[PDB]
Amino acid sequence: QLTLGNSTITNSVVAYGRWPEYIKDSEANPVDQPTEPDVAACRFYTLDTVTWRKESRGWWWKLPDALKDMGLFGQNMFYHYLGRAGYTVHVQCNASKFHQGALGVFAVPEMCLAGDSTTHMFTKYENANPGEKGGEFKGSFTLDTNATNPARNFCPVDYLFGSGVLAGNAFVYPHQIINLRTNNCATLVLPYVNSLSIDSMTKHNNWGIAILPLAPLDFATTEIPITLTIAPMCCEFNGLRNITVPRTQ
Amino acid sequence: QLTLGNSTITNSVVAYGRWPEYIKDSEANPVDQPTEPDVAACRFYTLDTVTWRKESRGWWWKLPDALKDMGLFGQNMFYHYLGRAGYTVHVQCNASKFHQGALGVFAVPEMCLAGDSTTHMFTKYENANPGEKGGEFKGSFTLDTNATNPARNFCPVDYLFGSGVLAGNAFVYPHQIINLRTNNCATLVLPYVNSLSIDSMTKHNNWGIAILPLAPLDFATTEIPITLTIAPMCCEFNGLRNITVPRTQ
Amino acid sequence: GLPVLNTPGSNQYLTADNYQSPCAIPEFDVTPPIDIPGEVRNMMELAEIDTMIPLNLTNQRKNTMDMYRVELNDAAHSDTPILCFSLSPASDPRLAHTMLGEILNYYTHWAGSLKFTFLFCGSMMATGKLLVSYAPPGAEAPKSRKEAMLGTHVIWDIGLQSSCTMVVPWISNTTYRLTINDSFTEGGYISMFYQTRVVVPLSTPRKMDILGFVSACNDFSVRLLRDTTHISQEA
Amino acid sequence: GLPVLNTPGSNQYLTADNYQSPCAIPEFDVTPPIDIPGEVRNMMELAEIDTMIPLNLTNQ
Amino acid sequence: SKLFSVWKITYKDTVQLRRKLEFFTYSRFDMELTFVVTSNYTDANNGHALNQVYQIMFIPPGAPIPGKWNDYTWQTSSNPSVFYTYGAPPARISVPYVGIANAYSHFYDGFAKVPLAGQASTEGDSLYGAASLNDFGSLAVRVVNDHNPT
Amino acid sequence: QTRHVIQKRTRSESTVESFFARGACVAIIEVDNDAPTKRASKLFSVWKITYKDTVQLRRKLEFFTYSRFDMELTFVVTSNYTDANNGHALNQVYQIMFIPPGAPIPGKWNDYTWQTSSNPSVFYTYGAPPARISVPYVGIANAYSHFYDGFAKVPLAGQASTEGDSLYGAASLNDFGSLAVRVVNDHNPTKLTSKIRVYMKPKHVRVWCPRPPRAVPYYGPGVDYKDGLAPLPEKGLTTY
Ligand SMILES: CCCCCCCCCCCCC/C=C/[C@H](O)[C@H](N)CO
Ligand SMILES: CCCCCCCCCCCCC/C=C/[C@H](O)[C@H](N)CO
């Protein structure tokens, strides 16, 4: 039973064996007094549930992007120039003893994804930051040929792990396997990982979450939901001003 | 209340935190016994008063040039090959509580001023050493096109601080602001600054005084006087001979 | 002779090298130093000196003394800014040519807090309150006092003190900002607004000037010496 | 000067050499490190991590 | 003929070192740069040349980029420059860790700008994964010699 | 409100030593190895030693009023053929003779003065690494003067206009002599042209009385200005 703030959840991987922690005085770059909302923002938020089908190729989210509209955490994120947080990611996917299938849940620091165009690094901010809905991996690469109105979106291929690396090696990242015959949940504890003590949450996504079907879902007859519950941890915010309002769509 | 010799004056800046001092035996280049007139020359002399108007661009003086005709100090200066002195500069400018305006008073070591001609370094001695009357800054640069009888004078532009540097940076020099709403006087204590322990006073001006209107004078209806009172300090003179009589006009 | 092996880099001239070389004037009796006033050990000493900001770079004011003066008047209160500029001390045109900007333009990286002092040059009879705000970057630059007041700010009573100093503390994602206009290392926004309004009695100037000054705090430092764009030579 | 004799190998550039060289940016105040998670000291650490085998390399 | 060339400093123009580095997300190291200089004649009917000297000037971000092979910028009063004599062993310099962050970022999952509501499409647009965390300046290379007949 | 930060940043690279710890080009001296009778080739060149022929080092130095430092001079020598139809040349040797004030200036590329019995001379072989020498602080004053607000002469009453006239700001405080450069080789059948680039590095630097930096283009050895008097660009008062 894992409790954070007013939220409780009732196999577990600490990424790099490093629990999330606050900035030490010896590593603090900004000088203003940080904001530490603690329980009001450091709590489990449940994202919109996705559906695992036989044909599903995979799903991806970005943190803190996926939580940008999650109550007071989102408010603090958009009201501050600088933000820092670890996470507890809880992937929930239950099925019967007569179902089969396996999911690889990977937490990837700096999870950059390949674009969909011959123009390099052309994925626009709106598509790179979908929010809680996240995005999906594709079976193959489809180059976007629309010159007038380019989609300017990611085209993350599953077996290339969306970034031109073999998916089988994605286990080098902190990960957990949800094997339907063994377990129905995965818990990943992610410390704040970055080349800086603190950064802009709106500009920069510190973590990516990739869920790939390692073994396709099957049932003797089928679709089962997957639910992500993410709690930001050891939140710190700096640089209070008027609220940021990112452009959307 | 600042008293020197027989003179008394009734906010204060010591340039470079160094009070004027006599030459130490370990820094004395000349070997003859120095002349130290003390009070007879180390006293406040009041220069001719200038008028601050709405259109005034600024004023400048050179030390010891401005004091060359100031009684016994001037006599000792012109009777000796070598002279050394610090200064106490007291700028006096009073107005009503209903006046507004601000003066920047800058003491500049080696205050070289730009010429008025395409010929480099062509300002003649008479114009470079105007005496107590000093000179004025100009709003813009006017090249002197008279080839037969060139003016051979300075053309010090105010926003270029008369020497091709932005006036806003002149605060790196020892300075004081006379803000009419706050104060009516500025006192600058200048030590003898030079690359030598002692030098020729007639050849070389150790200090320049530049008074610029940082905020133009204004009054609801206007002109107000500015009076400079300068006391040479820690005077030393060496190399007595017949009196120097510089060429004038 | 002693067996030696010349490595890569031999015979090069690196302008930043620090090697010994023969003296062309051996046994020269150097003139000893004297205790000249105002010795400088570090360029940051110059950067810590307040110098006047050319805040008003309009067409009719730039490259004149007027560019240093920002005009306040006694009109009715508004929330519109008196002045606005970005916290890019090396590349923002108002700050680039200050002494701090000049020093920073010889370096690639800068970090530390800044001091912005403002001097009110109106009459002694003028009263008023102003708001001076620093907004860290990432949001829309404050269009009005309502937004600006959400960031760091100071209320300045011109009647009480003719001068107000606001410290812009070092807040940055990176440990150093570049000395160029750069989105990733953007430093935020500085704005000034009327808090109440400038009030004058009769027979008093209804328009006056304020002056801006900027300097570096004691925590300021720079890195990666480089040539500046502020001086060039033709032909 | 000190008598020296240049041996074979002088003036070569061996890409695997380990020699000193002059610093192009002397007195640079290096940004200090922070305790980033997941530091790697040896490539074998990566080799000791289980990764999925592409066992089925059929045409389809 | 390009009398001078400006190359933005990066490890991404080639692949081998890039792949090795990108085995990892973050790195922190000093750098050793070795410059191997080769030259050749382009024709045989215009005489010969005297040994060339090359200037390799490091232009950190913000310093003026040369516009001509002999403009003022080559005075290099503050830019580090290496003058290499042709036929000498390859030039070599070292640099410490110069990242403005606490480590170099091989992957940056973000943008330099966040577009804001009410801004036009052209405004707030920056390349995905592009940050000044890897803005290390450039190298400007010229031949100091005045030209030969060939 | 502020937090506790254990600051680690130092000002090592902004010390006056570090700020000037670079070789800066102060002169490009052109010489020719050619037959003496061509009358267009300069077989020797005399350059008065100064930092004011270029601007970058000049501006950096003129951040301050007074300076005191030793100097490192590095000479980078480049050469080239001027035509292709007169054969080739053997490796050139260059003489760079320091002529202190008062020593006889050479009048011909091969006159007696090049014996350099008392003048320091550096003989540089072409293709060798750039020549380098060091000099201590040689000012006749206790510091070098970047700005001298005075004259070398004071005109006296009764003297004609021509007498007592000296340039404003010109003093022998910066009279450091000259460098005379020649190619020691006798000429080849083909003309060769060489340039010696002089790079100056102040060392053990001390400076006094900081000044605002030069803001408009330099015009002459003094502080005069004629052109480029509008360095500030246009920017709205309320434009971020
Ligand atoms: C004499 C001037 C030329 C020598 C100076 C060269 C300047 C080098 C300074 C830039 C430092 C680049 C360091 C490497 C950059 C790579 O992109 C990152 N390390 C990637 O991890
Ligand atoms: C072998 C002979 C050539 C090498 C000797 C070169 C002679 C150099 C002696 C003159 C010293 C000049 C020092 C620098 C002059 C500058 O104008 C001042 N330092 C300005 O502050």
Author numbering:
A (entry chain B), B (entry chain B): 84 to 93, 99 to 309, 313 to 340
C (entry chain C): 1 to 235
D (entry chain C): 1 to 60
E (entry chain A): 102 to 251
F (entry chain A): 62 to 301
Cite, word for word, the article reporting this structure.
As yields of PV2-SC6b were lower than those of PV1-SC6b or PV3-SC8 we investigated shaker flask expression of an alternative stabilised PV2, termed PV2-SC5a27,42. PV2-SC5a produced more D Ag/100 mL than PV2-SC6b in both flask and bioreactor expression systems (threefold and ~2-fold respectively). PV2-SC5a was highly stable, with ~75% D Ag remaining at 50 °C and ~40% D Ag at 55 °C, outperforming both PV2-SC6b and BRP. Detailed structural analyses and comparison of the PV2-SC6b and PV2-SC5a VLPs from bioreactor production were performed by single particle cryo-EM. Data were collected as described in “Methods”. Data processing yielded a final set of 113,853 particles for PV2-SC6b and 147,409 particles for PV2-SC5a, and icosahedral reconstructions of 2.4 Å and 2.1 Å resolution, respectively. The structures confirm that both PV2 VLPs adopt a homogeneous D Ag conformation, with negligible or no particles observed in C Ag form. The quality of the cryo-EM electron potential maps is sufficient to resolve the stabilising mutations and confirm that they introduce no significant perturbations to the structure and do not impinge on the antigenic surface of the particle. Based on the extent of the observed electron potential map in the VP1 pockets of both PV2-SC6b and PV2-SC5a, a sphingosine lipid moiety of carbon length 18 was modelled into the maps. For PV2-SC6b the mutation in subunit VP4 I57V (I57V in VP0) and for PV2-SC5a the mutation in subunit VP1 T41I, were in disordered regions of the map and were not modelled. However, in the presence of adjuvant, the response to PV2-SC5a VLPs equalled the neutralising antibody titres elicited by IPV to 0.25 of a human dose, as observed previously for PV1-SC6b and PV3-SC8. Therefore, these data suggest that in the presence of a licensed adjuvant, PV2-SC5a VLPs are at least as immunogenic as IPV per D Ag.
